[PDB]
Design a protein around this ligand. Structure first.
Ligand SMILES: Cc1ncc(C[n+]2csc(CCOP(=O)(O)OP(=O)(O)O)c2C)c(N)n1
Ligand SMILES: [Mg+2]
Length: 547
């Protein structure tokens, strides 16, 4: 006879999860036992919850959805930082927490892992704030209807959910899951709006000769990566990707120019959009960083904005549509308008140009490049990508240290890929211990620890003593985690040559991860980050305007 544990386990497996991540605790202990009972759904463990949640973050980038489990408040409050990151990056990460007993609710008791107050709702009062759905199971009869809700909403919205489950309830007997289809099927557009939406879009381009395509960050949540390719071709115009959305459009196809990111756009892409007649943004995320100090933000007269569920065209609005259904019906009536555009030395000290070049050697169609918040953002946005090659940024949320646990998670879902991690010295320190799990699971990850002895990106926004961080022997950390049983390489590289030696050892090494402490100079950095931090620093601290 099924139980709340089984029902949640199965519901996760049905929608996709081969792995759910967890951190033991006396509330979720009984619950965790029953999450094992499903054998198509494996219980991965983690060092702390802040990371555990970020690992489910990554996993959802590869699978499409992820999940985690934690103890009451003490575990979940840290995870909320990842659930914020999920909502930010449109990831259907499903958090789950253990919770007090049923007989303690409103019972005047104080419990452990809580504030000391007699109330325990404060947790999912918080969670609600950062999650599309928030659900407390306190009776096993409720269970299956609410779990379905939490999952169903998360997937429709492409935003995270929350499920707290009283420890003693987790065990109790529950119903059997209904067919999975109950959760997945979605409301589609309305034909009448859809019809008109396309018609007004056609006029936007057919009163012009030089259109452009701009690929937004939210494209992956809409599931429209395919339909953009069939539009870029059927239309033929010059495509460009945004700050995010790197590797959301393939860099083979003839229209792809590069990356548009304001006055720090990769060579030759700022000009095409400025010059052109109108811009077709497909689910963008313009903000103080994406617009680069509010300088590079498309208007409305010469802009079509095709956000996930609501489409603005010059002088008109539409709602109740979908980005995908819009780009399917568009890629048929669209006419073909075009806007055509027209080594280093080894042995010597290692330059940011050298390893950004040499790292581009690794880029296999079976490769996913995880670029951490930092200057590493700008390196990835210069690198040419093969077809099928992926890049993962976390720009909306930007928690440093996200990369490490999210690389661990991404790798559990896609272990046969070549998983490559560009992480700075400072970011790495926040979440380093989750490398020990890459060793535990024996995953072939290639960590490029961009060591520069400081928060270099933060230096070029506004410098100070707060940016100088204690330095580690980042290379030697690997050994400490390998300890008795693991197998994982820990290397260094102070020269352009040493890098090639380390990279060969990395591709060579199996049975675990490979870190490379690529030392470089702080002020040696991309020319974008230089001119970029200025726009952010002044916009950040622009003065109020008196009334
Ligand atoms: C948890 C968290 N704390 C602080 C910040 C602000 N912040 C953004 S980047 C950054 C510095 C990153 O340092 P590092 O990885 O070394 O960047 P690099 O020097 O490689 O460019 C800081 C402190 C943040 N985004 N997240
Ligand atoms: Mg650094």
């Amino acid at each position: 006879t099924y139980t709340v544990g089984h029902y949640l386990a199965t519901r996760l497996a049905q929608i996709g999860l081969k792995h759910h991540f967890a951190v033991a605790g006396d509330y979720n202990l009984v619950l965790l036992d029953q999450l094992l009972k499903n054998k198509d759904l494996e219980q991965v463990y983690c060092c702390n919850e802040l990371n555990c949640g970020f690992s489910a973050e990554g996993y959802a980038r590869a699978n499409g959805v992820g999940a985690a489990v934690v103890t009451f408040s003490v575990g979940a409050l840290s995870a909320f930082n990842a659930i914020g990151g999920a909502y930010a990056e449109n990831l259907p990460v499903i958090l789950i927490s253990g919770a007090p007993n049923t007989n303690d609710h409103g019972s005047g008791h104080i419990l452990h892992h809580t504030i000391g107050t007699t109330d325990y709702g404060y947790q999912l009062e918080m969670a609600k704030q950062i999650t599309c759905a928030a659900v407390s199971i306190t009776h096993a009869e409720d269970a299956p209807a609410l779990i379905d809700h939490a999952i169903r909403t998360a997937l429709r919205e492409k935003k995270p959910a929350y499920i707290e489950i009283a420890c003693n309830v987790a065990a109790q007997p529950c119903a059997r899951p209904g067919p999975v289809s109950a959760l997945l099927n979605e409301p589609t557009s309305d034909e009448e709006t859809l019809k008109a939406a396309v018609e007004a879009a056609l006029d936007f381009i057919e009163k012009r000769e030089k259109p452009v395509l701009l690929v937004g960050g939210k494209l992956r949540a809409a599931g429209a990566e395919e339909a953009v390719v069939e539009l870029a071709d059927a239309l033929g115009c010059a495509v460009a990707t945004m700050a995010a959305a790197k590797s959301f459009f393939p860099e083979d196809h003839p229209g792809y120019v590069g990356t548009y990111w304001g006055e720090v756009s990769s060579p030759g892409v700022e000009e095409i959009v400025d010059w052109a007649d109108g811009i077709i943004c497909l689910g963008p995320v313009f903000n103080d960083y994406s617009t680069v100090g509010w300088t590079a933000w498309p208007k409305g007269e010469n802009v079509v904005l095709v956000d996930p569920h609501h489409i603005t065209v010059g002088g008109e609005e539409f709602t109740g549509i979908h980005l995908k259904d819009f780009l399917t019906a568009l890629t048929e009536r669209v006419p073909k308008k075009d806007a055509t555009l027209d080594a280093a030395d080894p042995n010597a000290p290692l330059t940011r140009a050298e390893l950004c070049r040499q790292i581009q050697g690794l880029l296999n169609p079976n490769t996913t490049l995880i670029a951490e918040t930092g200057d590493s953002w700008f390196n990835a946005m210069r690198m040419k990508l093969p077809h099928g090659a992926r890049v993962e940024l976390e720009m909306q949320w930007g928690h440093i240290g996200w990369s490490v646990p999210a690389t661990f998670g991404y790798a559990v879902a896609e272990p046969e890929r070549r998983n490559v991690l560009m992480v700075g010295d400072g970011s790495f320190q926040l979440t380093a211990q989750e490398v020990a799990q890459m060793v535990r699971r024996k995953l072939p990850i290639i960590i490029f620890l961009i060591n520069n002895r400081g928060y270099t990106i933060e230096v070029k926004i506004h410098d100070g003593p707060y940016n100088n961080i204690k330095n580690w022997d980042y290379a030697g950390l690997m050994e400490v985690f390998n300890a008795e049983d693991g197998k994982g390489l820990g290397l260094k590289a102070t020269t352009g040559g040493e890098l090639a030696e380390a990279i060969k050892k990395a591709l060579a090494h199996r049975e675990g991860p490979t870190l490379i402490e690529c030392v470089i100079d702080r002020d040696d950095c991309t020319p974008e980050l230089v001119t970029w931090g200025k726009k952010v620093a002044t916009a950040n601290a622009r003065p109020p305007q008196a009334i």
